[PDB]
Design a protein around this nucleic acid. Structure first.
Lengths: 555, 417
DNA sequence: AATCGGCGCCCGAACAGGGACTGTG
DNA sequence: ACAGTCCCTGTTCGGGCGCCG
């Protein structure tokens, strides 16, 4: 099969650069003999040309086993040439998802054999792809070659092959507007509504079209029968699922092992509902030693047991129907953890997922719910090109009181309430007006910049005062510590007056969880209270108890 | 027609901005538009060996069903070379109409050495196919340099009409032509149609709207009336009885306002709270405090003196969500020296869509800055970055895009409404 | 493991940026 | 004014998962 007659893509080096001059490291005899057999084959096939001393460049070469195959893959460590190669704009903007596939009468999955090795490389750039194959006998010099086609391991190869495949498919795609061709790298999901007889006729027209352009679709890689193995999925005619997930079983684990467990559990969460990884990811905090052994905590092991429990049963997804509404439903599983399912008909999920990102030092469930609604919205636009209808565990009046009282602009698209506990609630609410008959606390705090020691106290209208000394603190922490004192030493109704915008903006946002231990202690007090009014006054303006407590903590 | 040489500003590369996901509604509109643009030679396909990209999306035109392709040329405009008097009466006119004349740019070819920087990528639903990339061969809508290169041709087209109607003010900013007059609303719209037909003799204007008479909330950015724009004064409460809490809020408000108004005093007011009293305690105002308050009311009623626009300094706009569909905004160049303070209310998504509101408010504030100063302000948006980026394109209808940043503001701006 | 490329997602952390407060005459 | 410290956000990179060459 001749090299593709498609025109090469002009490639340049970065301005003021030269080619790579990296010496070839020694190779094992098993790989040397495999590289020689491969190279003499692809010189006859034209993919490779011999070069002489005029070429002053080189790049180390090796060969790894092809993924689940007996053939060897020829790879080159073009890390030095990639640094000197011009930048590209990658045209692969995402990964196709089965949940976005519509129903089709006839489906075929193709695969181009020796894909990159079919597309030629720009003639002027070929000199920089020089490599050397070291022979067995060290007395023989070894044969130097250059690349005539897209090498594997060059940074431009994926983009150029992707661009080249689209130009090759364009005439066939225009000649047949009703045939769906999902193009990812060299694998072609071909789908039509024709009868099985007329479909195989068009597949052969497509295979002949690709054969004329030097793109072979080998019969060993030609799938004509469901189930289809496509993009790591199993494509049954009316359902889709992920290829078998293998969770490792070990008595002791290391960072690497947890990192693999986290990844596969994420990869499974697209269709397995309920995967949790928060406690498993918590073990990755601080330790950068890759081979360090980590004892599983009680929460992490419990979490792994839960994941394995829902992973022993197979789950399947459904394909997309453009005529029916898109529906997404979210549930609050753990603290900071959410799961969602996108479906059209109930109990027939297209795909599932999870959101468990902590945005900010202080946040509440309503914020996280709105963050998960946004993540689902974007994901739906990529897969289906439209926004789904939402089913959220939050009362209509709960959200209404939040977005009307919050200073930032927040919105959730068309959604309906589902009574699936645990519900999303506002655990406390600050009063809009000062409470009559409630002790007024004037709080402040200070700290030294060098000593890091500080004070925090309050004064009241009933004459009650307090000042607490603090060690290893900041100005921001003492004004938070002062509010904590007022909440501790008061009844169920209290008026608090602070001079700290920092402390005021945290409390007014109604957080229910925080990365700060001190804030969580303040939150616990606010939920216990019945009425809390928080007021702000400018510091150093001779106002009320603020002046009295400022002198108490500044001394 | 030979092309004008264009360079980037010294030491800067072209834009490299990823394309964001688009709805099927928008992708189908873009593909239809671009397929026709490639046929007429206005754009052409490119590959990944062009390392530049600029985001593209589509907007539905004002009171129309047709789609307009909008390129986010903000990054390219920062990096494009600068080329080489603002009508103060345009803001004084009764009626001002905004005409999208961006289609005229597609008749002037672009410098070949520059076209690589106008590359954009059309995405595909579910990533069925890789992105199909195009670059521009003609002057693109939304580019900083298009009105400058076309400036010579624009004065030539308008000179006959401006001498036939010398009482009409015509300002140009990017793709849009701002046409102002003091005529009555009906005679004004006929003059606009007269200008549209005069342009048709040379270049095509946006297809007319489905309505000839102003429909409710569909000509917001189209037919604007500057002589009715009002500034929002800072006000103080009027109570018969004042509490300690009420006086503390007042002093804090006045002390902050003292950064904008020099004569604001709070001494006699703070004396009323010299104890350590309860917030609900009623405090009678002494004779000294009543005068200081009454004088602060006067200072806040008079406009600020000595605040003038500096054409070299950027404009900055801050918006505050006041609730009940009401939004306050301030436009300034230096802190506490506001060039304008306004208020917006009763916007679409009535009582429901906060993001649609903020997106509309940003457009009207920008519109006002183009009419008044001929610039666009950098916006400090009171919204989460991802909340905004998810939804803002769904409510945008302007041909320009202002720069913005996102801020988490303390809720002590209770000083504007 | 040595020993490659491009894309997407996740989670943890290094680095930068910006605003408020405070300390200096 | 000017320079710090504190705290917070956002960007980028390190690891992993998956696709494919």
């Amino acid at each position: 099969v001749p090299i593709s007659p498609i025109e090469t893509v002009p490639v340049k080096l970065k301005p003021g650069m030269d080619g790579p001059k990296v010496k070839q490291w020694p190779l094992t005899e098993e790989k040397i003999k495999a590289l020689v057999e491969i190279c003499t084959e692809m010189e006859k096939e034209g993919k490779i040309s011999k070069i002489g001393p005029e070429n002053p460049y080189n790049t180390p070469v090796f060969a790894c086993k092809k993924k689940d195959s007996t053939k060897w893959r020829k790879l080159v460590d073009f890390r030095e040439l990639n640094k000197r190669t011009q930048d590209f704009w990658e045209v692969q903007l995402g990964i196709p998802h089965p949940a976005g596939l519509k129903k089709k009468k006839s489906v075929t999955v193709l695969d181009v054999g020796d894909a990159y090795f079919s597309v030629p490389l720009d003639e002027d750039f070929r000199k920089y792809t020089a490599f050397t194959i070291p022979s067995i006998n060290n007395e023989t010099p070894g044969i130097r070659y250059q690349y005539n086609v897209l090498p594997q391991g060059w940074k431009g190869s994926p983009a150029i092959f992707q661009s080249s495949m689209t130009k090759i498919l364009e005439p066939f795609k225009k000649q047949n507007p009703d045939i769906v061709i999902y193009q990812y790298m060299d694998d072609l999901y071909v789908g039509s509504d024709l009868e099985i007889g007329q479909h195989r006729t068009k597949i052969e027209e497509l295979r002949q079209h690709l054969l004329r352009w030097g793109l072979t679709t080998p019969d060993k890689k030609h799938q004509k029968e469901p189930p289809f193995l496509w993009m790591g999925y199993e494509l049954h005619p009316d359902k889709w699922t992920v290829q078998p997930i293998v969770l490792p079983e070990k008595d002791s684990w290391t960072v690497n092992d947890i990192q693999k467990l986290v990844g596969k559990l994420n990869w499974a969460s697209q269709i397995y509902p309920g995967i949790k990884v928060r406690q498993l990811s918590k073990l990755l905090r601080g330790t950068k030693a890759l081979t360090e052994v980590i004892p599983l905590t009680e929460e992490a092991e419990l979490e792994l047991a839960e994941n394995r429990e829902i992973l022993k049963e197979p789950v399947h997804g459904v394909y997309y129907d453009p005529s029916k509404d898109l529906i997404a439903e979210i549930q609050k599983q753990g603290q900071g953890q959410w799961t969602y399912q996108i479906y059209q008909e109930p109990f027939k999920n297209l795909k599932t997922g999870k959101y468990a990102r902590m945005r900010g030092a202080h946040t509440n469930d309503v914020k996280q719910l709105t963050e998960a609604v946004q993540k689902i919205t974007t994901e739906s636009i990529v897969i289906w090109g439209k926004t789904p209808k939402f089913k959220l565990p939050i009362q209509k009046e709960t959200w209404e009181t939040w977005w009307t009282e919050y200073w930032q602009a927040t919105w959730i698209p068309e959604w309906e309430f589902v009574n699936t506990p645990p519900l999303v609630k506002l655990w406390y609410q600050l009063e809009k007006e000062p409470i009559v008959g409630a002790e007024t606390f004037y709080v402040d705090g200070a700290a030294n910049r060098e000593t890091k020691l500080g004070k925090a106290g309050y004064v009241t209208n009933k004459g009650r005062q307090k000042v607490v000394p603090l060690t290893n603190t900041t100005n921001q922490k003492t004004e938070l510590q002062a509010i904590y004192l007022a909440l501790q030493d008061s009844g169920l109704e209290v008026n608090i007056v602070t001079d700290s915008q920092y402390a005021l903006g945290i409390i007014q946002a109604q957080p229910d969880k925080s990365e700060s231990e001190l804030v969580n202690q303040i939150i616990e007090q606010l939920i216990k209270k019945e009425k809390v009014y928080l007021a702000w006054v400018p510091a150093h303006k001779g106002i009320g108890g603020n002046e009295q407590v400022d002198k108490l903590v500044s001394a | 027609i030979e092309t004008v040489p264009v360079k980037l500003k010294p030491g800067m590369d072209g834009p490299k901005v990823k394309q964001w996901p688009l709805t099927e509604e928008k992708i189908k509109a873009l593909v239809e538009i671009c397929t026709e643009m490639e046929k007429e030679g206005k754009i052409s396909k490119i590959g990944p060996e062009n390392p530049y990209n600029t985001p593209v999306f589509a907007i539905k035109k004002k009171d129309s069903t047709k789609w307009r392709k909008l390129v986010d040329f903000r990054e390219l405009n920062k990096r494009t070379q600068d080329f080489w008097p603002h009508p103060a009466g345009l803001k004084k006119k009764k009626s001002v109409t905004v005409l999208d004349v961006g289609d005229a740019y597609f008749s002037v070819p672009l410098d070949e050495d520059f076209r690589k920087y106008t590359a954009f990528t059309i995405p595909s639903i579910n990533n069925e196919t890789p992105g199909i990339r195009y670059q521009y061969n003609v002057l693109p809508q939304g580019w900083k340099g298009s009105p400058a290169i076309f400036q010579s041709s624009m004065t030539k087209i308008l000179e006959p009409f401006k001498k036939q109607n010398p009482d009409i003010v015509i300002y140009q900013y990017m793709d849009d032509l701002y046409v102002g007059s003091d005529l009555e609303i009906g005679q004004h719209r006929t003059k606009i149609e007269e200008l549209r037909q005069h342009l048709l003799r040379w270049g095509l204007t946006t297809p007319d709207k489905k309505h000839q008479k102003e429909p409710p909330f569909l000509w917001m950015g189209y037919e604007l009336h500057p002589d009715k724009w009002t500034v929002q004064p800072i006000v103080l409460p009027e109570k018969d009885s004042w509490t300690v809490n009420d006086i503390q809020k007042l002093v804090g408000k006045l002390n902050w306002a003292s950064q904008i108004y020099p004569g604001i005093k709070v001494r006699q007011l703070s004396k009323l709270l010299r104890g350590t009293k309860a917030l609900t305690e009623v405090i009678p105002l002494t004779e000294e405090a009543e005068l200081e308050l009454a004088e602060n009311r006067e200072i806040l009623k008079e406009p600020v003196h000595g605040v003038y626009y500096d054409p070299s300094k950027d404009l900055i706009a801050e918006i505050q969500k006041q609730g009940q569909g009401q939004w306050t905004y301030q436009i300034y160049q230096e802190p506490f020296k506001n060039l304008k303070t306004g208020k917006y209310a009763r916007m679409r998504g009535a009582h429901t869509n906060d993001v649609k509101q903020l997106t509309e408010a940003v457009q009207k504030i920008t519109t006002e800055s183009i009419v008044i100063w001929g610039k666009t302000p950098k916006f400090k948006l009171p919204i989460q970055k991802e909340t905004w980026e998810t939804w803002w394109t769904e409510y945008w209808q302007a041909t320009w895009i202002p720069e913005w940043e996102f801020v988490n503001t303390p809720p002590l701006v209770k000083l504007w409404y």
